[PDB]
């Protein structure tokens, strides 16, 4: 149930999506907050409700959600989202 959404934000800065999950919350990094016209309408493929497990090359590290943050933070201006259906 993988779904790749390529979100490349430049200049403007910031993304426009929110996540939470990991071994800390005993959950997967799931999208929980999506601002209108934000990465949901900017990548024409983002949207809360989907389960997240991979970015910029399937990287959702097993610790806490920040394992994704570390992944998305240091990666590149392109956020590749691979999502699974809960």
């Amino acid at each position: 149930g993988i779904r790749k959404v390529l979100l490349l934000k430049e200049d403007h800065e910031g993304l426009g999506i929110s996540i939470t999950g990991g071994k800390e919350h005993g959950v997967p990094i799931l999208i929980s907050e999506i601002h209108p016209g934000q990465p949901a309408d900017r990548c024409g493929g983002l949207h809360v409700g989907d389960a997240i497990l991979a970015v910029n090359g399937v990287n959702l590290r097993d610790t806490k959600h920040k394992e994704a943050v570390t992944i998305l933070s240091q990666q590149r201006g392109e956020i590749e989202f691979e999502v699974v259906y809960v």
């Binding site: 996540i19 919350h25 990465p39 610790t63 920040k66």
Partner: peptide
């Protein structure tokens, strides 16, 4: 914020 969850 401090734990590990996040907002992009």
């Amino acid at each position: 914020e401090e734990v590990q969850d996040t907002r992009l």
